[PDB]
Paper text:
Carboxysomes are a family of bacterial microcompartments responsible for CO2 fixation and serve as the central component of CCMs in cyanobacteria and some proteobacteria. The carboxysome sequesters the key CO2-fixing enzyme, ribulose 1,5-bisphosphate carboxylase/oxygenase (Rubisco), and carbonic anhydrase (CA), using a polyhedral protein shell. The key CO2-fixation enzyme, ribulose-1,5-bisphosphate carboxylase/oxygenase (Rubisco), captures and converts inorganic carbon to produce a sugar precursor through the Calvin–Benson–Bassham cycle.
In this study, we isolated intact β-carboxysomes with a reduced diameter of 169 nm from Syn7942 cells that were cultivated under low-light conditions and determined the spatial packaging of Rubisco mediated by CcmM within the smaller β-carboxysome using cryoelectron tomography (cryoET). We further determined the structure of Rubisco within native Syn7942 β-carboxysomes at a resolution of 3.5 Å using STA. The resolved structure of the Rubisco L8S8 hexadecamer was oriented along its 4-fold axis along the radial direction, in good agreement with the reported Syn7942 Rubisco structures. Intriguingly, an extra density in the groove at the interface between antiparallel RbcL dimers was well-resolved. This density matches the Rubisco small subunit-like (SSUL) module of the “linker” protein CcmM, which contains 2 α-helices packed against a β-sheet. As it sits on the 2-fold axis, the 2-fold symmetrized density appears a half intensity compared to Rubisco, and space can only accommodate 1 module. We thus deduced that one copy of CcmM SSUL can bind to the RbcL groove in either the up or down configuration, but not both. Each Rubisco within the carboxysome has potentially 4 CcmM SSUL domains that can bind Rubisco at the RbcL dimer groove in 2 different modes.
Residue numbers in the entry:
A (entry chain F): 225 to 310
B (entry chain L), E (entry chain O): 8 to 108
C (entry chain I), D (entry chain R), F (entry chain S), G (entry chain H): 20 to 65, 68 to 331, 338 to 403, 412 to 461
């Protein structure tokens, strides 16, 4: 994980937002096609970071996008493209 | 007489090897083949008659060739064409001739 | 199915359409499965060779959240997001057809009721909206600072166009801003519409001239056909008639949109009646809650809407919904999702059903000057009602609590108002 | 109330209109007063000075007889009489506006349930009705001594206009009579209606060349506005399409009748989808029953009508109502009222829903030849569907009882036909 | 004869106290006074003549009151209207009369 | 100024329109003030009484960042955001009018240079867009897997319409997908359009007959008047012409958008020419960038668009913008912002200016099959061009590198192709 | 190249169109060869078998005069002849496409401009020209002896249509003959066009009845599409509106020309707005100088045109080119050619940009009684500005030197005018 991503996920978790991740190959990524990833059910920074790194490793050479979710509202509050195939 | 066809028509009639190459390329770009035909060839007549299935669970070109052989064994006097569809871009991406009477 | 249409970790994009479905599944079906099915019918129905030509994913409906209903048993809310690609732009009809065209007909659910839609901003901009809106309405009418007054002609049938116009005249001149056709009246043998029109238009003109106040009567243009409805609207125009009426839910949403277009272009104020609505909304346990119909109407376009005679919280919720350009999500008033109407004008709410002019301070406090009050008819009565309106408006306008002093203001008003003194006697 | 609107002894005029109401009053209210009120809110509502300038007597909703429902408690059937003069001529919208405009919102009823009307022969006679009718459609299309076959295109959305037409062609050459739009598809961004219609038209033409049987596809024309519907319909006709498709509840009854007129003048068959009908019929205590909607539509006009996959009693009753010229009152099949239609042409029923060709012989048994069967799909499967249909018809003709022999029949049919044999393997 | 004015004209002629209290509450919600005058009041006539500026820098109703003295004193045979404008909601929320001939 | 328009910490909303302005403030003008000033010019300009009847808040343009340009002096990229509500829906003319209507004349800035805009999704959904899109284009034209060929008639002036067809015919039969009008050639006294229409159309028809491939020419419709432009338009329709051409810079955008609407209604492909552009774009320190115009165009609607013979990196930038549904920000390729289009179909690139086919393997590499190629004129030459194209397509799909191996491919194609052998021999 | 596109000794024919160009070529290319090329790509581009079937030599753009720019290095002025047959009768768009369509892209020029054209009398004729011009506009407005006076309506955006008509009323009753839209206003969602037009219309009728002198407001009809744009022109005509607005760069030529014909056919004055005007002509080295645009406009048609704020000598050049019907070739005024205009009626120029009422003596001694002097705001200010105008008009007419006596006259005017006294106070 990059520092800038680390500092983003810290900021997201500080506010109480939940973390989710979505993955897609280069052709689906072209067409704004994303798929659900393994749910990160953990509020601790360390465990979140670890599960994100594991999910990145899961889907090597595919687009990965990180997002901020407010459970109460159930609405998205941040969009961020974290990883690219190259 | 001079009748031509849409793609690759000005090349020499594709050899089985060349057809395989083209199918191969289709596979690696994930566009499963569709085989279709008609006893005539009209540019206005957009559609053609599909060869009883599109081969989505395609792993090798040699299956698509073998399909083509069955079609000419039954319709050897009929033009035959193979198509590739990009379900993600929602576009037909291949269309060329493999047989003529 | 849940594995395909339940994505609990999905969160909707701002460009999705979110539909809240209240459901009491049939025994044996878990609630999660039931919400996956709901998501399934309206966004897929359901294999076939054609399936894989397309990317299924893009065109799926996700129920991203399921909860039970507080204080109810066997009850849950499904919140389902919809890709913007699914619906034609500017077509309420298509939206309804996709969401509720066949999910209602399903078997596993014992009862389903659509609660609310959160139409994405982008999808809102594809609908012109109310032809004028509240503000343009106020400007065209040049009336300010008070809720409007509407009355219906009675009896609903039998009056001659000449006698009917008589009635309309007496009602206007006594001090009502507005008069209205009954929803039933379109061309009955006893009253044909064109003679109705010419009578009543001349009555409003004469009430105008005498008052010095722009007057309005709601002329129905609900007609058997599109072309007919075009002629009645045209003929209303040509008489300078400042407002018309339609019965959207009977006639149609597409005809209503058509009327929206015509009137907008011709600058004609639109009123919308709300016939049949109880066939869908009456039952808290099934059908569609009316707020959906309201939001669909204002997407279709209409400057007025019956808001009922008055759950008061859910009243306020959807009344706000159909006035305020932005609403926040809140379940006490019923609002399921935050909605942004992108600066789009809101619609005027219309109160009817025996507004009981002794309750008028209640309504005025409820709803505010941005609201219309309809009586459900003689010149003194209409004067009295208007006086009272004004008297209560002044009282809140100096700072008085309407609630507690409504009776005191009435008595004060009636002291200097004979006609209102007599109406209070009633 | 009861003193004026309850007339238990009145016998209804041929020229009255009769409405069937099952209903549960609120506790305390007697049944008679409940029916009286029902009638009032539909007719006159409620005194004013204008009341007695008409022959008040003339324009009633006369609740003229009542009963409890057998085997249920606090539920009572009311029949109410309606003079013919109450209604404009040719306006489905108007008839529904007064019957059910506001009575469903009447408080003292626990639940209200509109079940039937008997349209007086006079009131029938002013509607155009179906553009062509069953017989004239069969004469057009040449399809004789059997029901017709339809397959809905799947997946409902995603398919390219080119693929969509490819699927059409498959389905049609395999032998289906017709192919239909999903009700939802009107202009979705991934399919622009015009390119769809061109594709479909060229595909039908080329299938019809192949096959030598009339092919047509049920092209949806439901649009956000009237002008868009008229355009799409003009286009359709410019290509020689024989039929279109419309969604009368969602779009509305006025827009529907417009379309029925335009088709009558343009020679174009009309298909009606009943999307949303569930929102009005599904519950057994509230809403307007599908049969009434069927009356109102065939009065409006349409050549097809979905009627469910198939209570079997009710189904068989209201399909006969919408088929035959004269029917007789039968409470067992739901037909309250005796209705005559003065030879006005019928409509073809449509049944859909994954209709399990194993069960099709049941369907021919139920429905008879003048019907249409739709299936929710490749060329071989359509050929298997067609051969089974033709076998079944032959067998029914011969004498073999369909209910006891259907499986066997499908046996022999499949023995010589491979596509049918494979389908039956499934 | 029976000519009437759109808001409040069913109530008694607004006394100085009543107008003052109208303005007072107008300003409680941020509305700044407007004054316009016309010799007539026609229902078709949206616009009147403006009273040489709107009083956007209002602090007390009395200034607007003495403004209306002076409008009288120069246009004492003409109708006088007061208004307020919701620049937030972009809605005009007050328009009523204070002077007749 | 800077105290207000410059809102460094301001987070853009999804509902704002974002603009990138490279500008050179005059010496002594601070950059920050320059960016405030540019934000005012295109939002509000500048107090008078009326200023406070409006909430200025809602309708200011907000400069939320400034940066200095790397490797350049005194030049700074400005990014400004606007609320959506400044814009009439579906008017690119209004886009331009507000962004660029006065900023360019601003006296504090030595040079102002628009680069990039972001359209929010909602403002997208208000435009129709290209009449058919890539895929629907390819579907109507029934060619796949390859980019298309285009030749321009020469000499641009003096060829009699008979002759001019005769040239068209030789071009097409030799195996070009398309011929084209030249931007200038509209009804010249030596070439009246009507007769030109008639002869060229008949030439396509007979070529289509001989060759059996769908041939089309790009028929200019830019006309002095809206109504002229129409009549030209219909009469191209009546001849079945599948495609036309319009110069829209010279003509504007409102006329172009009409034309896109007409064509979408009538099924007609709309080629775009892109003349008068170097008047705006070529200069690198002042003017509007071709990607912006291309955005704007396609929002208006158009099937083809020139992108240049080929900075290759900016070319890839705007090409990938004007075709793909989603693109990501790339300052290396000139895409400031991140854009989304919600499945709105893209537009086909066209390259002209002496394509010089011995470089064609490069062009196929650069652009991909979804593109069109213009040649800057006999039947063998066109044959050679086509043979090369097909050979290079084949080679690329064979996995052979186009770049490295162009010359070898072209030799092997020429060995069996005398007409390509001769063409290479030049 | 030179040998065919360089004709130094060629005296142009009377009928020739001449276009003056300023250019700076690439290192290496001599000026003459750049001139031959510039000639070339505008007419003939470049050989093909279709060549000797044409008379090339006839339609060649001949460069018959090259000179260096005095006191400048690497710059020169070119004159090139272009047979009248080269452009389509009465088509502005096509001349700009031809002359300026791609010539800006020719790599061999570092920078180019179009500086002037000579529109020959014969090519002048065809264009419909201004709908009304100066003398007819003065007739239609009954104003003579002084230049007209306007204010711009501020703030540019945020008003309610009622408020914007208020503002307009106050500016017109101020003493300005005219008022205007802001170019950034056609249909903004918070304030729609139809409300605006009705309001402003009412406001003018009130102004006219109040003053008894012609009163008016420049209304904006610029649209997304031609059809709504006709509809705006029609609606404006329907209200007795004198004059409208257009944005001839953002909607282009064929749009304004449509409006020019339509106006001439409708007796409704036209204004032309110049949004984007700085994009093209602003720099000193490149683009097209603004008088070409002005002249092209005069051809296409518009009553009014912005001229900015005010170099001077060229200013007067193109001002004259757009007022007098023969202007001698005058270098120092940037009039490169003599322009016989065929009696073509002139255009009233419009000067705007904070016209700084103190400076009108210089303005209108620059621009004359035949000029429109538009101001960028209450009644007293406008009355003052009319005072000053009338004072200065009298003072010239009776013999006073304005350039020197402007302060004296202004003060003298202000002595009896308290409103112009309050205005000189500020």
């Amino acid at each position: 994980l990059s520092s800038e991503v680390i500092t983003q996920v810290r900021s997201l978790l500080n506010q109480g937002y939940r973390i989710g991740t979505e993955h897609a190959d280069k052709r689906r990524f072209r067409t704004s096609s994303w798929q659900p990833c393994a749910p990160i059910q953990s509020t601790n920074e360390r465990q979140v970071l670890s599960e994100l790194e594991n999910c990145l490793s899961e889907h090597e050479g595919e687009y990965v996008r990180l997002l901020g979710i407010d459970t109460n509202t159930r609405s998205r509050v941040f969009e961020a493209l974290i990883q690219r195939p190259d | 007489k001079e009748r031509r066809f849409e793609t690759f028509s000005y090349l020499p009639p594709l050899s089985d090897r060349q057809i395989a190459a083209q199918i191969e390329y289709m596979i690696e770009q994930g566009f499963h083949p569709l085989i279709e035909f008609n006893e005539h060839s009209n540019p206005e007549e957009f559609y053609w008659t599909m060869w009883k299935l599109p081969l989505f669970d395609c792993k090798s070109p040699q299956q698509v060739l073998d399909e083509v052989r069955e079609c000419r064994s039954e319709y050897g006097d009929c033009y035959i064409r193979v198509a590739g569809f990009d379900n993600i871009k929602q576009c037909q991406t291949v269309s060329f001739i493999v047989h003529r009477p | 199915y849940k594995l395909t249409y339940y994505t609990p970790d999905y969160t909707p994009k701002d460009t999705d359409l979110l539909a809240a479905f209240r459901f009491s599944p049939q025994p044996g079906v878990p609630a999660d499965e039931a919400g996956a099915a709901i998501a399934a019918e309206s966004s897929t129905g359901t294999t076939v060779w054609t399936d894989l030509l397309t990317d299924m994913d893009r065109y799926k409906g996700k129920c991203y959240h399921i909860e039970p209903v507080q204080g109810e048993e066997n009850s849950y809310f499904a919140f389902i997001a919809y890709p913007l690609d699914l619906f034609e732009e500017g077509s309420v009809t298509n939206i309804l057809t996709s969401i509720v065209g066949n999910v209602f007909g399903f078997k596993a659910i014992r009862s389903l009721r659509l609660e609310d839609i959160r139409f994405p901003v982008a999808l809102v901009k594809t609908f012109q909206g109310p032809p004028h809106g509240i503000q343009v309405e106020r400007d065209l009418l040049n009336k300010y600072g008070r809720p409007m007054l509407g009355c219906t002609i009675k009896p609903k049938l039998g009056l001659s166009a000449k006698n009917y116009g008589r009635a309309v005249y007496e009602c206007l001149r006594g001090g009502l801003d507005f008069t209205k056709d009954d929803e039933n009246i379109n061309s009955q043998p006893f009253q044909r519409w064109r003679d109705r029109f010419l009578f009543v238009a001349d009555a409003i003109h004469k009430s105008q001239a005498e008052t010095g106040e722009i007057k309005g009567h709601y002329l129905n243009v609900t007609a058997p056909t599109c072309e007919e409805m075009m002629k009645r609207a045209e003929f209303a125009k040509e008489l300078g008639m400042p407002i018309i009426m339609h019965d959207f839910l009977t006639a149609g949403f597409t005809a209503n949109t058509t009327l929206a277009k015509w009137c907008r272009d011709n600058g004609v104020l639109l009123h919308i009646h709300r016939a049949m609505h109880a066939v869908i909304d009456r039952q808290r346990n099934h059908g569609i809650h009316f707020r959906v119909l309201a939001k669909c109407l204002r997407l279709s376009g209409g400057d007025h809407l019956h808001s009922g005679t008055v759950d008061k919280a859910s009243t306020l919720g959807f009344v706000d919904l159909m006035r305020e350009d932005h609403i926040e999500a809140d379940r006490s008033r019923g609002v399921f999702f935050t909605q942004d109407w992108a600066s789009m004008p809101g619609v005027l709410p219309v109160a009817s059903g025996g507004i009981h002019v002794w309750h008028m301070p209640a309504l005025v406090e409820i709803f505010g000057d941005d609201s219309v009050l309809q009586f459900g008819g003689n010149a003194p009565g209409a004067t009295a009602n208007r006086v009272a309106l004004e008297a209560c408006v002044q009282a809140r306008n100096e700072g008085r609590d309407l609630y507690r002093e409504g009776g005191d203001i009435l008595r004060e008003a009636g002291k200097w108002s004979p006609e209102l003194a007599a109406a209070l006697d009633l």
